[PDB]
Design an enzyme around this catalytic site. Structure first.
Site, PDB file in Angstrom:
ATOM      1  N   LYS A   1      10.014  -3.490  -8.186  1.00  0.00           N
ATOM      2  CA  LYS A   1      11.325  -3.664  -8.811  1.00  0.00           C
ATOM      3  C   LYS A   1      12.248  -4.527  -7.946  1.00  0.00           C
ATOM      4  O   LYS A   1      12.920  -4.018  -7.046  1.00  0.00           O
ATOM      5  CB  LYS A   1      11.967  -2.309  -9.094  1.00  0.00           C
ATOM      6  N   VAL A   2      12.260  -5.832  -8.228  1.00  0.00           N
ATOM      7  CA  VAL A   2      13.123  -6.792  -7.532  1.00  0.00           C
ATOM      8  C   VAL A   2      14.476  -6.830  -8.236  1.00  0.00           C
ATOM      9  O   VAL A   2      14.559  -7.230  -9.399  1.00  0.00           O
ATOM     10  CB  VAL A   2      12.523  -8.210  -7.540  1.00  0.00           C
ATOM     11  CG1 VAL A   2      13.426  -9.177  -6.777  1.00  0.00           C
ATOM     12  CG2 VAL A   2      11.122  -8.198  -6.945  1.00  0.00           C
TER      13      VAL A   2
ATOM     14  N   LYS B   1      13.954  -5.087  -3.050  1.00  0.00           N
ATOM     15  CA  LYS B   1      12.600  -4.869  -3.530  1.00  0.00           C
ATOM     16  C   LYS B   1      12.247  -3.420  -3.267  1.00  0.00           C
ATOM     17  O   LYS B   1      11.918  -3.044  -2.143  1.00  0.00           O
ATOM     18  CB  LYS B   1      11.612  -5.795  -2.818  1.00  0.00           C
ATOM     19  CG  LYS B   1      10.179  -5.706  -3.334  1.00  0.00           C
ATOM     20  CD  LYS B   1       9.287  -6.739  -2.655  1.00  0.00           C
ATOM     21  CE  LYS B   1       7.833  -6.641  -3.089  1.00  0.00           C
ATOM     22  NZ  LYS B   1       7.638  -6.978  -4.529  1.00  0.00           N
TER      23      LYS B   1
ATOM     24  N   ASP C   1      -0.560 -16.654   1.769  1.00  0.00           N
ATOM     25  CA  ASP C   1      -0.170 -16.914   0.393  1.00  0.00           C
ATOM     26  C   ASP C   1       1.045 -17.869   0.286  1.00  0.00           C
ATOM     27  O   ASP C   1       2.059 -17.547  -0.342  1.00  0.00           O
ATOM     28  CB  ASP C   1       0.133 -15.559  -0.260  1.00  0.00           C
ATOM     29  CG  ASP C   1       0.167 -15.618  -1.768  1.00  0.00           C
ATOM     30  OD1 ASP C   1      -0.323 -16.604  -2.359  1.00  0.00           O
ATOM     31  OD2 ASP C   1       0.687 -14.658  -2.364  1.00  0.00           O
TER      32      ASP C   1
HETATM   33  O1  EJY Z   1      10.543  -7.402   0.254  1.00  0.00           O
HETATM   34  N1  EJY Z   1      10.010  -8.483   0.418  1.00  0.00           N
HETATM   35  O2  EJY Z   1       9.342  -8.974  -0.478  1.00  0.00           O
HETATM   36  C1  EJY Z   1      10.190  -9.193   1.701  1.00  0.00           C
HETATM   37  C2  EJY Z   1      11.014  -8.636   2.675  1.00  0.00           C
HETATM   38  C3  EJY Z   1      11.196  -9.281   3.881  1.00  0.00           C
HETATM   39  C4  EJY Z   1      10.553 -10.494   4.108  1.00  0.00           C
HETATM   40  N2  EJY Z   1      10.526 -11.372   5.168  1.00  0.00           N
HETATM   41  C5  EJY Z   1       9.717 -12.407   4.824  1.00  0.00           C
HETATM   42  C6  EJY Z   1       9.437 -13.584   5.723  1.00  0.00           C
HETATM   43  C7  EJY Z   1       7.985 -13.629   6.100  1.00  0.00           C
HETATM   44  C8  EJY Z   1       7.425 -12.593   6.826  1.00  0.00           C
HETATM   45  C9  EJY Z   1       6.084 -12.634   7.171  1.00  0.00           C
HETATM   46  C10 EJY Z   1       5.311 -13.717   6.794  1.00  0.00           C
HETATM   47  C11 EJY Z   1       5.877 -14.753   6.072  1.00  0.00           C
HETATM   48  C12 EJY Z   1       7.215 -14.713   5.720  1.00  0.00           C
HETATM   49  N3  EJY Z   1       9.242 -12.226   3.623  1.00  0.00           N
HETATM   50  C13 EJY Z   1       9.720 -11.061   3.122  1.00  0.00           C
HETATM   51  C14 EJY Z   1       9.546 -10.387   1.911  1.00  0.00           C
END
Ligand code: EJY
Ligand code: EJY
Lengths: 259, 258
Positions: free
Chosen positions: A14-15, A29, A122
């Protein structure tokens, strides 16, 4: 770095859009919602910590977390324009110079991640978020680097070596390949491989060296960038350059040719 | 004869599915701890009831016993015995140095269990470490906590991708594939394909002959068990052996070597 559910207001979707009480606008999220049962809070907090240490202007920042009984959320910063593919497909066509910044910023962020030992498994336009004046941050919205939070299409950007060999450990060169395909998408204003009938036909076609159609792209895209994506999407992993190797040549190119 | 009411239980409390499967812990008014699986909150009452009796008739030391069924108003639930340490993978991760003789014990018992099930015409449609429960002294019992192998109870309800046979991504060789990966999982102390990023990636990969990495395993696991899991995960389901075929070779090998 902890937070509470009472602190936020309603939210759309849930975003969801989390209006914090004092600090203001963010995105929430919620990863889990239900009974209570979750025994392993400790690992969740340390890996929230472990991804709180990622600090960069070109990377998405974990603002905080919520660890309460019937709810588990990751609070990150709001990016006004959405993801990159939404920006491209938006009715206004983005100019060459903005696309140049975006690309340099993607390189900057990845180099930082690879600097910290985090291989992005990804990388794709859906994980590239954009603010109001086209500055970008890289996310991992599928939590592919966060084992424990996961315990609570993409294939176009996946490197050949990983297709039909899931035991192969991702390297730096795995997401350089994904970078290549992001470049295509940036100048194509759409997702690649739109003519394919079978998804299994596509996967084997891609393994054997087939790439997105550059013929569509030559009109709107400079030659140094076309060469870059072909280098980056080489079938051989060793043939591909590192992100610092890309940075070193692309930064002077952006500054002196694109502004 | 096997029917229970909700009011027979004092309280219930959800459990983490990582450790215990999609189950609640309940307290029976006179009988103490049990685990309750509420599957739903007239349609197919007769089939559901007789399927419960089908699983009430599964009585084997290495297989979970059904203790009762609640069928009332808008609630259908199953009740089974409490297994304290939870599922196998939960135990393998918490119990660091689980020795070779105990893992042999567990494998023989999984084999005992599955041959019995097949002997009763029951093919496990979802064998995996989370469906292998462990009692206090490290003996095991096979369960089907998703109720995949019972047609009607799964429908009422309406992890696995790693253990599903490539042809199905059910015959008597389907769950022999699952068992093969359980063998790997047992000596690896972890679930397979950790590097896999996408669902569809993994499905095409396994379908074209990819299998768990044996290199994360060679030193802890004896060489006959490596041959056994390789045979049991052959792409061709005829190449795979039967559980009675496996039991005959593994039983003596357990006794003399481990
Ligand atoms: O809730 N989320 O979906 C979420 C939360 C915090 C995040 N911080 C990053 C940066 C990142 C970290 C590790 C590898 C590549 C990019 N993405 C996030 C996604
Ligand atoms: O509450 N439950 O969910 C439950 C209850 C009783 C069970 N008895 C078995 C044994 C079994 C059946 C079919 C294939 C393999 C093993 N599983 C059960 C699951």
């Amino acid at each position: 770095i902890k937070m509470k559910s009472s602190d936020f207001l309603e939210s759309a979707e849930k975003v969801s859009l989390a209006f914090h009480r004092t600090q203001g606008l963010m995105i929430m999220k919620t990863v889990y919602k239900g009974p209570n049962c979750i025994e392993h809070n400790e690992a969740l907090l340390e890996e929230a910590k472990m991804m709180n240490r990622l600090r960069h202007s070109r990377v998405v920042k974990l603002l905080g977390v919520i660890i309460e009984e019937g709810k588990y959320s990751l609070v990150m910063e709001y990016m006004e324009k959405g993801n990159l593919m939404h920006v491209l497909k938006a009715e206004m066509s983005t100019p060459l110079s903005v696309k140049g910044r975006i690309i340099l910023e993607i390189i900057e962020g990845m180099a930082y991640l690879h600097g910290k030992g985090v291989i992005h498994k990804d990388l794709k336009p859906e994980n590239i978020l954009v603010d109001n004046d086209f500055h970008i941050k890289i996310a991992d919205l599928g939590l592919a680097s966060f084992k424990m939070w996961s315990k609570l299409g993409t294939l176009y950007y996946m490197a050949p070596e990983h297709l039909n060999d899931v035991n192969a450990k991702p390297t730096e060169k795995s997401d350089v390949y994904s970078f290549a395909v992001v470049l295509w998408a940036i100048f194509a204003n759409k997702e690649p491989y739109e003519n394919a009938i079978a998804e299994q036909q596509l996967i084997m076609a891609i393994k054997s060296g087939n790439r997105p159609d550059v013929d569509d792209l030559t009109e709107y895209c400079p030659r140094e960038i076309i060469s870059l994506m072909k280098l980056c999407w080489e079938a051989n992993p060793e043939a591909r350059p590192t992100f610092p190797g890309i940075e070193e040549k692309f930064r002077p190119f952006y500054l002196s040719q694109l502004e």
